[model samples]
Target: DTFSRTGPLMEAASYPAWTQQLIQDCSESKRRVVEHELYQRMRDNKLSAKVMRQYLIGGWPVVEQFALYMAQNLTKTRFARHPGEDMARRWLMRNIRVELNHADYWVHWSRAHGVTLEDLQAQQVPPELHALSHWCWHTSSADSLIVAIAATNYAIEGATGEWSALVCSNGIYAAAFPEEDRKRAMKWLKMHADAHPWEALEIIVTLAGLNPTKALQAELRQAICKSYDYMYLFLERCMQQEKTAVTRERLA
Candidate 1:
């Protein structure tokens, strides 16, 4: 099937009725992110450098592991020879290739935020944030392919697409960096602001076969909701409170 390069969610009508409820359920989490107090602070230039640094440290691992989630999801594909299965594997591999370099974009953006690769690498994900990566790792590795995509790509990246465009388009957030580095710093944010999630939904709608089975529909809804729950918590954590959440570097 030829994929049109348009907003995937905007064309949800093309998919089955099940997708509507699935997508609409995420709006609460989407609002939590797109209008979160932290992002609002960012847009209004009301954030402290330390809080922004909180973002750098808190977000680095999640962003770094995003590709691994895609790669892990990729492993679940191509084993079946069906057409939807074929398309599934292709998209997963393609997304993994594209996702591989985004970690570096996060690094550059972090650097502009005064976080160096050394600092980024110098610590653990902290016990508080472990569940973020843990959930994705567990999902991609153990859950069915459709469920994994719903959790990571459809739920996570889909909302990320909304928030990134929200924060960056306002200019205040990106304006913190030097002029020369502004665009480069936003590369990761900008890339996700486009059709990233739309691509994931294409696979989802196709794989679910338009009329998703009751089981697949329930799984999709659960995975997406859990991802949003995690996102809600993660965003709340993104804003540092009291003492910064920290763990010392290990000598391993």
Candidate 2:
């Protein structure tokens, strides 16, 4: 009922209008990431072994930092005095735990692609790629709980589910690894493609209220857009780094 302020966001009659527009905004930028040539290559199994290694190593920092960011956001929720906080806190706890095991899955996934756990652990994060992780830390720790959740959980995870689904659904990419290794690899992708973003959207909308003022919605749009912009740049850099490595390999 519009009379109440709790329950599933879809069931809420007062779900915010600006929230819907922000979702569309987030979706548009997410397409820019998922449709990148690097991921498209991945989807088609046209990505080379060296490129996969390069990309994985380059992205390793962000993978490792995700849970920490969630934890940081979790701390903020404890201090939250907002409407939808209890749900956001519970959601953050589950996601933080999910992220804890996710790094291991990345290691497992990369092992099949030729990057060892040692390699992932040892590689330096590229300067370009660090922008995303740095922004995550800053935002998760510094923003409003609603802003933090909207940016990372809603925007970043939203894009992730898409690219993960895009690549994981390709039997050709899954075929690149053995049956056993494929299971481990796809675990990360499959889980990411699950309900995290949808859940986050509900939290965001719930927190914002069904009829959020234009001002608060603007703040969310800014944070979500910035998050996606950082992600868009990060993906572009991951592909570029690999291309540079392959070029150098050929030159050498």
Candidate 3:
């Protein structure tokens, strides 16, 4: 099948009913995932302060660098090997470019929390964050655009959207930052989540086309489920709170 160059093949309004519910159901799985006890003992205010610091200092450059690298490599690799996948790769690259400048917003957001970019980069991120980053890069690099969109854009971003909305809105970061910052963070959080399901729908549908068998379909679906659950749990630990509750409330 040829990809349309000018427009989105799958519009938000065209999402299958089952796909929408599946994303929501995957989001709710966060309630069952617990935060780490080590972080729990660290105190909420201090953790939020630390997390904000880690994001600007350690994460911004990582994201900025990765966004640029992934876009270029994914385009070159896919265009060389499986040119058909270029449509999805281009779609993924477009989203990555849109997020490229988010590092700046993160820096500004951290400043409001009294965390400097220098201090933030110097802060230690828990091992899980590093693990997740490595996992995303590995999947995108070693695998197909189907996996790229499925893992990075759909599952990771999908989970982040949910977790961000909850933590940013429910006085997690708000305790350290002002109303504007809290709202600003939540805006992106909700926006990413809101957009994720749609993009994910397209990626998953594309995957189903590649392998139509029930077993493969079920396998990919389960992998996506596992990824969504993993990120939610990871963020829940980082935020030191139950995120599924906030995610649920937001969808409600």
Candidate 4:
């Protein structure tokens, strides 16, 4: 938290405070995501397969762009300074590997909902949604390595864990899907919640500890909060679009 602190040596001491800050920054967004009508509908099985289909269709670009953001972040590791850079590189490499081929998982999950990967590929992304993908890539690609990780790993993926848990753990909700569809959906949901989801927070604390400066830590916090802002908007867009369609159908 000090602007005068130098080097990664104090990382052990400084890491906890930064981790706590990240958690606080994300708490509101996480709450909003979990309590959103989308998951509520999911819990009730009132969300039609059609609405879920739209969500999966509109979500393909997000899945594709996430890989790109992580890939760009990995390239930024080359610019990491010595002492901590090597560890950063190793950790980022491992993180990116976890992201690789994740779009394939989404494709499989989408297929289970009767939306083919080809269908997703063939449809043009709406401009509003397309902007979200662009923002994700541009934000991560242009920022500092720490900032990128804060935005993608800490902010975006972190909040994702919240919503996925609500969906995956809701047995009454999950039961709405056919067994095979549920399997695919549950697989994707559990993947985010289980195993190393908080790696981003660790990465941030590690980087911030190495730098040990207020300016850098503040920048990281800002970047993560900005990412949450985007996430809130993204979640709202997906919810509104699908819910609107569902409402119109019911009225008809």
Extract clashing residue pairs from model 2: 14-210, 15-210, 16-210
Kindly list the per-residue Cα lDDT of model 3 for residues 94-209, writing each as its tens digit: 76767755766666656765767675566466665555565666666665555555666666555555545544444554455465566654443334436554565575664444
Models sorted by lDDT, best on top: 2, 1, 4, 3
Q: How far does residue 134 in candidate 2 sit from its true spot (Å)?
A: 0.7
For residue 180, model 2's alpha carbon misses the true position, in angstroms, by 4.6
> How do the predictions measure up, each by TM-score?
0.85, 0.84, 0.62, 0.81
In model 4, where is the ten-residue run with the lowest total lDDT? 1-10
Give stretches of model 1 more than 4 Å off. 1-9, 124-126, 240-252
Top candidate by lDDT: 2
Count of clashes, each model: 0, 3, 2, 1
> lDDT (CA) for every model shown?
0.74, 0.75, 0.52, 0.67
Q: List CA RMSD, all candidates.
A: 5.8, 3.3, 7.9, 4.4
Q: Residue 244 CA error for candidate 2 (Å)?
A: 5.4
Local accuracy of candidate 4 as per-residue lDDT tens digits, 112-137: 77888788988644554555566678
Ranking by TM-score: 1, 2, 4, 3
Give the TM-score comparing model 3 with the true structure, all chains together. Answer: 0.62
Candidate 1: residue 2 lDDT (0-100) = 32
For model 1, what is the error of residue 120's alpha carbon versus the real structure, in angstroms, after optimal superposition?
A: 1.4
What is the Å distance of residue 164 in model 3 from its true position? 2.9
Q: What does candidate 1's lDDT look like per residue over 23-133, in tens digits?
A: 776667667766777766766666666666667776777788888888888777776655556767887777778877888999987888788898788744445544666
